[PDB]
RNA sequence: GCGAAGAACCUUACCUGGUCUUGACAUCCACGGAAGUUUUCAGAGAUGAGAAUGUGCCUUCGGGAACCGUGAGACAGGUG
RNA sequence: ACGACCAGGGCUACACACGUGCUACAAUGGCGCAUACAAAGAGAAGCGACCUCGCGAGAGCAAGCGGACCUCAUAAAGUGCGUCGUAGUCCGGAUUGGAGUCUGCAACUCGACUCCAUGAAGUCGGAAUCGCUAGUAAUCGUGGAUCAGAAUGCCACGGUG
């Protein structure tokens, strides 16, 4: 995409939020290469999470989502082979995808029954901030504003 | 050219010819003919005369034991003799690097400490103490000095019945005792087809002083790893794959170096080497 | 009970925790667990063990622990005795339930070996 | 292939009249309970040769047993090897 | 083990297994005829089936009866 | 050759078919057999006459061979022996009847085949291939074409090679692939080495 | 998981043993079996050995076509 | 003769390494149950209902219908509940046992099926490859092809993504 750079591909939403948001999210965890089953043990955690934002499953994810997703980042491309430090602006398609992937990626193959719990686990604690995802946002953020010496 | 087939050892390379000293041990300057080429001082040819010049139309050159870029120089070797003093800086690398190869080729080593004499009882012992991680590692020393050529005899009797080679760096006295060795010098040296020699209590010695100053050849990966069979067992020590004889977890090799079991000298040589062919 | 497949199968999705356990297998240590009826889906101890344990008895007439073991045992060397193929396999350390010998024969002949 | 592996085949059929009798493919319409009737499941003082299984496929035009395929008689090489051109009623890739 | 509904025998074998009866268990015979089964009838020798040279005589040991004359013998040759 | 062609897709799309009898599946390798068992003899029997194209059909289901020759009156023969003998064959080795049609070609310089079978039937004579290739290809883009290829593999000149010399001759593509391509080979197989001939004659494009 | 869309043997070639050698195949010719048939036995089978049957047109029921091999070359053979 | 025939053996051996795969590991995961939407493939030696049984294997028997005529043959993921609770587990399945069943002349070597018994490693893969960016990754079924007998594969097959 060195001619014309890009994000992602069919995705698949909700029948009752139609959020792309959790759309792009549900589906991350596809490489199941079927979200017809995916998108069911979060929703636990995000019911939970939906106890725990005061709102619904929804705006579960929402509360944990926007404080998961980076607001700036470091980018790389490598031109010329150079390693690229400057401060930059996470673009959205990244802000959102890497974001959801985050609190996915946290939350994993573990050591006991059921994702739901496993997922609750993971979902209120990014929605709190102290999350693993939002402290991607606030680790990236850390390197930004501080490196700017190398091209 | 043709004359009348004869079997000869060549002698000596004769620059242009060689020089073949026959079955009788009559040594002729021949021609080396156009069609042959697999030829090298210590083979056994069919030389001819003319109807000296001769030409050479058969050679022997048996296996492999030693080589430079890779292109064998003779054959029988059954021993190389790692000859050396530190001129004109040396390394443990580059003792190993022959070593190494020693061990590769299934040539002998009878590690050579040359100057045993110039070393004061700390420096000799010190000497002494890394010709000793050779040794230990299992190839013998003999003292020597290149000068006094001593342990003369220690190695003459390695000589005898095989053939042997003097190997090292700038004329570290090599030169010397090979011309005790021979009792007449041929060779003084300080800071592929050559010229061969006989032994009287039996074996032979081959010798060229270019070699001498050093520079190195062109190698594969395994025979700097058959320098070391150590490594072997330490392959199987960590996994049915070690990572690589060299650091990883779980890089048994490296784990005994870690551990000493090991010496630290056979890692390094494998990479001077392993960066050399490389 | 136990039910000679020798423990108790319980808690678990629980007959199924005598497949391997020995003796009864699958079959066997489902047939005797729901001959006292006791779940399957939860456990099985959490009933009264003298109606599993005539069971464990019951199956004290299948072929069980350490004689079925033993049974696997002395039929794999009746095979040798004769000497066979199966025999031959098992005489030459060679899987008798199999796994090629070039490649990664492994949890017969040890899971890995150069 | 060769003449053989094809010219084997051809071969095998004689005996039966000089010497044997006939049951071609009439010797195990008894040997399970079709309803094993022992009647064709038991003489071999008499050849041992041939079988189904002992039969093949052999290439018509190498007489290769195998690399052989149920559609053409032959295998896959002359198989292909003759399909491209046409000369035949109908054929494609095109995208396929 | 697994049952292939029906074993086998062989006739120009079989009537060898009573050659080896009526000339008993006298030393191994050569067939080099496999599709046969081992019994407790192939008792009346132990009996030598081709194992692309080697005709190995299989023992009548009739624990191997559920196995051809090749379960017992020899075919392939190894490390 | 090398390549999976120019055709090296080419199959039936676009194609006018040979055999162009509607057998059906259950005999259609055998329509074919009898197809190609009279393409196979067919291109025997004439191999003088000139066949520059057969063709199969089986009007209901009762084979019918037609002949593009570069003359039908080679074909027929004198007295209609040489079309009588087709019938006996491709009645009986098409078994669906013989017809045997004759026609006559529009140009033998447009076939990829005439042109090469020409060329080696000229090489052979003790011509050289250019010669004979030349003479071809030449006057097949004359007008016997507008394009001709040849594009060659196996021994040439009896080197220790078998890569693309060719004698493409006028406009003729091998890419632009709704290409009227005559394509063909021959080949002297040589008793040196091995020469192919590959010629193909560019008839136009579709 | 390379050419089997199949390597049990077979296939099969290749081991390995066993066969054959105008060759296993071929082709004519003779020749016999017409063709071609009916059936037994024995050998690992290769094949080894038995008895049976029918030959239509032309016609050494050989031939020719039968249809095969042999045998023998001519001729035949090779994924040798 | 290498021609060439056969028998029977040979691949596929085994310290093995390796590739190139296959597979676990699980968590909704394994496990029980409940329970819809696929498609695409295949038929007349045929495909093959019923039927019948067999868990099945198998086994016994068998219509329709050359295929929008019947039938091979059917999605499953989907979907509705429990269970268990990454436990070498119901994971996970090696390993084996023990026997059914199958195909092929016979599989006994070097052929294929159920049950039963047995149930490693494996817990996510060190070092170390590639792939891939959508219907890809990735995933559910599904299937063909041809092999006498065998589709980790190919060849196919549509769902879901």
């Known amino acids: 995409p060195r001619r014309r750079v890009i994000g992602q591909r069919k995705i698949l939403p909700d029948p009752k939020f139609g959020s792309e948001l959790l759309a792009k999210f549900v589906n991350i965890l596809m490489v199941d290469g079927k979200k017809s089953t995916a998108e069911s043990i979060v929703y636990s955690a995000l019911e939970t999470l939906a106890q725990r934002s005061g709102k619904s499953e929804l705006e579960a994810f929402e509360v944990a989502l926007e404080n998961v997703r980076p607001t700036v980042e470091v980018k790389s491309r490598r031109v010329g082979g150079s390693t690229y430090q400057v401060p930059v602006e996470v673009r959205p398609v990244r802000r959102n995808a890497l974001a959801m992937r985050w609190i996915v990626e946290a939350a994993r193959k573990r050591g006991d029954k059921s994702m739901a719990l496993r997922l609750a686990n993971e979902l209120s604690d990014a929605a709190e901030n102290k999350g693993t995802a939002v402290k991607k946002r606030e680790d990236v953020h850390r390197m930004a504003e501080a490196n700017k010496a190398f091209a | ?278 | 009970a136990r039910i000679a497949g020798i423990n108790i199968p319980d808690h678990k999705h629980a007959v199924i925790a005598l497949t391997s356990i020995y003796g009864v297998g699958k079959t066997r240590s489902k047939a005797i667990l729901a001959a006292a009826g006791i779940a399957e889906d939860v456990k099985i101890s959490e009933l009264s063990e003298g109606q599993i344990d005539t069971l464990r008895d019951e199956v004290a007439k299948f072929v069980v622990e350490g004689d079925l073991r033993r049974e696997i045992s002395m039929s794999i060397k009746r095979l040798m005795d004769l000497g066979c193929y199966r025999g031959l396999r098992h005489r030459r350390g060679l899987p008798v339930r199999g796994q090629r010998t070039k490649t990664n024969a492994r949890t017969r002949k040890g899971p890995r070996k150069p | 292939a060769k003449q053989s592996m094809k010219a084997r085949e051809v071969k095998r059929v004689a005996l039966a009249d000089k010497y044997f009798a006939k049951r071609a493919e009439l010797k195990a319409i008894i040997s399970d309970v079709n309803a094993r009737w022992n009647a064709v499941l038991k003489l071999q003082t008499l050849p041992r040769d041939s079988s189904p299984s002992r039969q093949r496929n052999r290439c018509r035009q190498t007489g290769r047993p195998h690399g052989f395929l149920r559609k053409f008689g032959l295998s896959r090489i002359k198989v292909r090897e003759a399909a491209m051109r046409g000369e035949i009623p109908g054929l494609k890739k095109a995208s396929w | 083990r697994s049952l292939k509904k029906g074993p086998f025998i062989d006739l120009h074998l079989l009537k060898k297994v009573e050659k080896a009866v009526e000339s008993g268990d006298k030393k191994p015979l050569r067939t080099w005829s496999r599709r046969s089964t081992i019994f407790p009838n192939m008792i009346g020798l132990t009996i030598a089936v081709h194992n692309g040279r080697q005709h190995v005589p299989v023992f009548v040991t009739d624990e191997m009866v559920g196995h051809k004359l090749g379960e017992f013998a020899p075919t392939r040759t190894y490390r | 050759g090398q390549k999976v062609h120019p055709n090296g897709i080419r199959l039936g799309i676009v194609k006018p078919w040979n055999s162009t009898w509607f057998a059906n599946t259950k005999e259609f390798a055998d329509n074919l057999d009898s197809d190609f068992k009279v393409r196979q003899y067919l291109t025997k029997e004439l191999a003088k006459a000139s066949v520059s194209r057969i063709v199969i059909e089986r009007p209901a289901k009762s084979i019918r061979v037609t002949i593009h020759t570069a003359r039908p009156g080679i074909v027929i023969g004198k007295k209609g022996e040489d079309v009588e003998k087709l019938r006996k064959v491709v009645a009986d080795i098409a078994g669906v009847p013989a017809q045997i049609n004759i026609a006559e070609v529009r140009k033998p310089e447009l076939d990829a085949k005439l042109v090469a079978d020409s060329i080696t039937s000229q090489l052979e004579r003790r011509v050289m291939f250019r010669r004979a290739m030349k003479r071809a290809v030449q006057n097949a883009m004359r007008l016997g074409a507008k394009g001709i290829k040849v594009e060659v593999s196996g021994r040439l000149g009896g080197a220790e090679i078998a890569r693309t010399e060719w004698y493409r001759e006028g406009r003729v593509p091998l890419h632009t692939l709704r290409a009227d391509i005559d394509y063909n080979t021959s080949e002297a197989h040589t008793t040196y080495g091995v020469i192919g001939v590959k010629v193909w004659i560019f008839k136009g494009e579709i």
């Open chain 2, 1 to 278: 050219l043709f004359g009348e087939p004869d079997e000869g050892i060549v002698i000596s390379r004769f620059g242009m010819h060689a020089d073949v000293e026959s079955a009788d041990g009559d040594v002729h300057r021949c021609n080396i003919r156009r069609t042959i080429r697999s030829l090298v001082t210590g083979d056994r040819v069919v030389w001819r005369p003319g109807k000296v010049k001769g030409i050479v139309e058969a050679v022997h050159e048996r296996t492999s034991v030693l080589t430079r870029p890779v292109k064998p120089i003779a054959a029988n070797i059954d021993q190389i003799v790692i000859v050396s003093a530190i001129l004109p800086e040396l390394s443990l690398n580059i003792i190993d690097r022959y070593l190494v190869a020693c061990e590769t080729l299934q040539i002998e080593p009878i590690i050579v400490l040359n100057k045993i004499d110039l070393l004061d009882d700390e420096g000799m012992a010190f000497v002494n103490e890394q010709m000793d991680i050779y040794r230990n590692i299992g190839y013998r020393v003999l003292m020597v000095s290149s000068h006094t050529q001593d342990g003369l005899k220690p190695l003459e009797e390695a000589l005898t019945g095989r053939i042997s080679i003097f190997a090292g760096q700038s004329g570290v006295g090599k030169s010397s005792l090979l011309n005790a060795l021979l009792g007449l010098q041929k060779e003084i040296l300080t800071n592929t087809a050559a010229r061969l020699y006989h032994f009287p209590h039996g074996g032979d010695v081959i010798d060229s002083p270019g070699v001498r100053e050093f520079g190195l050849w062109h190698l594969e990966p395994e025979q700097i790893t058959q320098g070391f069979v150590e490594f072997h067992d330490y392959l199987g020590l960590c996994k049915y794959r070690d990572c690589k004889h060299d650091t990883d977890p779980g890089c048994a090799i490296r784990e005994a170096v870690e551990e000493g079991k090991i010496a630290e000298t056979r890692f390094e040589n494998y990479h001077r080497i392993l960066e050399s062919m490389a």
